[PDB]
Amino acid sequence: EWQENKSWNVHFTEHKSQGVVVLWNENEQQGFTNNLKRANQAFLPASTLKIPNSLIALDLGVVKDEHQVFKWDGQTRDIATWNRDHNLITAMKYSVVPVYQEFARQIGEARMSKMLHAFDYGNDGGIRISATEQISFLRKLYHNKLHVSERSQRIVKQAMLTEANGDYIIRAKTGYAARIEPKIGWWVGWVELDDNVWFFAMNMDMPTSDGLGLRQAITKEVLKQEKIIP
Amino acid sequence: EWQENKSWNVHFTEHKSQGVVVLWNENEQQGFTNNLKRANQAFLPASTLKIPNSLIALDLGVVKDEHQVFKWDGQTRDIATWNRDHNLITAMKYSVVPVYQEFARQIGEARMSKMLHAFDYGNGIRISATEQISFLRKLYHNKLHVSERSQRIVKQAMLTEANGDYIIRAKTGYAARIEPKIGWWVGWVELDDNVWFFAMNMDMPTSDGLGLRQAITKEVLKQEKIIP
Ligand SMILES: *C(=O)[C@@H](NC(=O)/C(=N\OC(C)(C)C(=O)O)c1csc(N)n1)[C@@H]1NC(C(=O)O)=C(C[n+]2ccccc2)CS1
Ligand SMILES: [Cl-]
């Protein structure tokens, strides 16, 4: 069901990196990857977990809507985009750790773990997901099949909006797990075409911060190779 | 409250076109046009009516959701992108008039008018560029008399363009039957901490000029520090 495409490995080596790319054809329901064992290999979700978190914040009423403002606490941090007020949409955009940590605290770990367990997500982070596992969660979200309000899922799906043009829409989330060796960077989401939807999940070795861009770059070189995007 | 930046006219003349652009700064509650007269002049809404039409079709349940397929009837119409199955999102993107006609037949002229009159839309049905903004501002704010789900899903279906700088939600109109033949573009642009509603119409002497609807608008957004 998951075909392997060695020919994708050149994109990682051309950028002198290692990683995995997992595609899912929704109409056909075939998976495609450059490496299965790493595809099914589980890592920390670092910020790709702000997706299910936002669902729980919303569905439990920690977040009224995407317009509600979460003021700055006044503490200058070392990411300047973090030193401002935010709503769920901007907080997702700049991955504002301080904001989502104030969700995790108004919500409690007990509900978190049980709620994330209902999502069938994993198993401070707290859990471990593989790219393949990351795509099965994404498809549930796409189809409003998680057991929370459709309002929650539609709001999160709006906040995942990364890029849209006359040819496709991308809804995704970046991550970077950089507390445990290996440090590894995530990009999971999907690309919406006129008559099909391609899910993807990629992760790769990220010892620096300087290669984060390759997360999207290497993924987009695959989607061109497969003629998915022009 | 409504101001005239006449300097925008160079953008119409530069393509030897004539039209109006109407911008509404949301945070500042102040609006801008290149032509006070033509801004408030009423025109057929032609394809910009698909926004309220979609609202009504969703909120009465004729369309279950943005995924539901409306199969192509089989008539090879002139416009190629119509000749295929669509859903609410692709129907809106390609302005698929026959898909929406089946909506109408389903809903009835009666419920369609009543609702459209609960949206405070038109005045044979006409709407000015400034009037489009008032309606859009109520959709953006989820304040029209239809469910919230309805208004969200339509706002998803209007998505046109998005990057890390801005998001644009809009609908085009092309009207020819009576004169003049005019083009529409109405929508808003979602900034980090503001939103900018816009409604433009213009003279569409030829069909070729269709892309000048977005082009002339963006030159005004670009000229206004709204987009880069
Ligand atoms: C909405 O604007 C739709 N307009 C029409 O279908 C046409 N006229 O609408 C009239 C009758 C004027 C009205 O008052 O409603 C029409 C069909 S053919 C023609 N010369 N005028 C569709 N809107 C759009 C658009 O905004 O661009 C179209 C996209 N398009 C146009 C030409 C070629 C390919 C694609 C189709 S019409
Ligand atoms: Cl959206």
Residue numbers in the entry:
A (entry chain B): 24 to 146, 159 to 265
B (entry chain A): 24 to 146, 161 to 265
Quote the authors verbatim.
Low catalytic activity for CAZ hydrolysis has been attributed to the substrate’s bulkiness, potentially requiring sampling of alternative loop conformations to promote cephalosporin binding and hydrolysis. Here we reveal how directed evolution of a β-lactamase yielded highly epistatic activity enhancements.
Five mutations accumulated along the evolutionary trajectory, F72L → S212A → T213A → A33V → K51E, resulting in Q5 conferring 43-fold increased CAZ resistance in Escherichia coli. We note that upon CAZ binding in Q5 (Q5-CAZ), the Ω loop becomes highly disordered to the point that it could not be refined anymore, which suggests that incubation with CAZ leads to population of a state that could potentially be less active. These models were constructed on the basis of the Q5-CAZ crystal structure with the unresolved Ω loop taken from the apo wtOXA-48 structure. Notably, S212A and T213A enhanced the correlation of S70 with the neighbouring β-strands that harbour the oxyanion hole. This increased correlation could be rooted in the increased rigidification of the β5–β6 loop, harbouring the S212A and T213A mutations, which in turn allows for a tighter interaction of the loop with the substrate.
